[PDB]
Design a protein around this ligand. Structure first.
Ligand code: 7Q5
Ligand code: 7Q5
Lengths: 221, 231
């Protein structure tokens, strides 16, 4: 493809993703969280359309990626928002919870926030990671041209991460180490998403996960 | 500990040397029932686990951890480790899963067990991805060791902070090792960072498959893992 996305510099990629960032939204615990997530989803769709390369995909492939990524995306945002509140999860500025208000999944989310803190994760890195989640989470479960495009965009995001690190003065060795540390946390975000989904099902909340058709209609709108 | 003093070459040699052996029951009644196929796979996994513990003990850094932390890591990783091994064995058999030399199954056979075809299809896609990437054996063994160290590190006092820090340093050494292998192969710096990312991103898919596998469902107990570690 002669795609605009593939011509982007590291700086343009960061700029696009920072510009696409949704606002931090305000708020029965499950009731509150469901209402918040539902409002977040609307923003997520519109954000996804702004991730470079995402709209080059067929509508079907866009929906597939969103279906596979949505809860991981919510989670990573939660973790980012909570990074400067040790021991707490900032679901919203008016819904900031500690463990006691929880717990298995709460504890996993808190450990991720601690990891982000210990690594001094930067906003520019965060937005790259969130975009990787969107592009990567569904890419192994899809056509050939689409997968190739996704992987080329993913490679651009890698290049962008490395450029950011090099600009901040990290040595080559530090760059590769940090890249790996950031990407390895994604496996834990996937794990938490799967546990979350298993828990949404266990609480009889199958209804609240967005369907293929819901996402499709939301993308078209 | 000297694990963190290893060179990239020594890390690769240690991991290659540590590799566990590769059979299923001879002449099982075929076709399989749901019960009989699950019986075969359970028997195979159970025997593989014993060799997995022996392998884990030889992953540089692993035995520096407390016994409790060793078991925690194995509890979190065991299914992913079995699955990556399966995917690796299956690379040169497009459309098939080489559970054992004598148990080579296609996706239609996954249908014999309720819920299993979906996991089979994900495993097959991973094998195709490894093939498309020309995954090398030296890379494979690094990735498998990453899984062991990474999967449970986020779900663990001064001691605990030192345990986590040690794990992360060993993970850093394996990263360095992967990069060295790539640089030695002649990849450009850009190509190196790209391939590293591509490989680590597949690990999130392996996680996913393990989680789904665990669900749809014979899981090894804390006590069994601990006994095997001590023996
Ligand atoms: C009646 O109220 C109750 O008793 C039940 C209370 C309760 C409350 C949360 C629980 N989880 C574990 C966590 F986050 F708490 F640690 S979670 O299921 O994995 C699930 C995941 C994550 O936390 C839940 C919630 C969610 C998502 C979609 C919905 O439609 C409704 C809720 C998430 C979320 C993350 C980021 C964000 O920006 C917005 C939402 C578990 C029991
Ligand atoms: C925990 C135990 C467990 C039980 C069955 C499960 N699945 C079926 C299910 F659940 F889908 F029906 S599976 O994901 O396909 C899982 C994957 C693959 O098929 C299953 C099986 C297994 C592993 C341990 C057992 O005791 C029994 C069966 C596999 C395997 C075996 C050896 C190997 O070298 C590589 C892969 C998953 C988790």
């Amino acid at each position: 493809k002669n795609s605009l996305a593939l011509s982007l510099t590291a700086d343009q990629m960061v700029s696009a993703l920072l510009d696409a960032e949704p606002p931090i939204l305000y708020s029965s615990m499950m009731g509150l969280l469901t209402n918040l997530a539902d409002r977040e989803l609307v923003h997520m769709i519109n954000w996804a359309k702004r991730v470079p390369g995402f709209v080059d995909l067929t509508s079907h492939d866009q929906v597939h990626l969103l279906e596979c990524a949505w809860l991981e995306i919510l989670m990573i945002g939660l973790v980012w928002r909570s990074m400067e509140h040790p021991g707490k999860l900032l679901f919203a500025p008016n819904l900031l919870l500690d463990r006691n208000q929880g717990v298995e999944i709460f504890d996993m989310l808190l450990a991720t926030s601690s990891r982000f803190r210990m690594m001094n994760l930067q906003g520019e890195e965060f937005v790259c990671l969130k975009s990787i989640i969107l592009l990567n989470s569904g890419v192994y479960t899809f056509s050939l041209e689409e997968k190739d495009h996704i992987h080329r965009v993913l490679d651009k995001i890698t290049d962008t991460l490395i450029h950011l690190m090099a600009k901040a003065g990290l040595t080559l060795q530090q760059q590769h180490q940090r890249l790996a540390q950031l990407l390895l946390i994604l496996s834990h975000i996937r794990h938490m998403s799967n546990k979350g989904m298993e828990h949404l099902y266990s609480m009889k909340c199958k209804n609240v996960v967005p369907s293929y058709d819901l996402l499709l209609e939301m993308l078209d709108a």
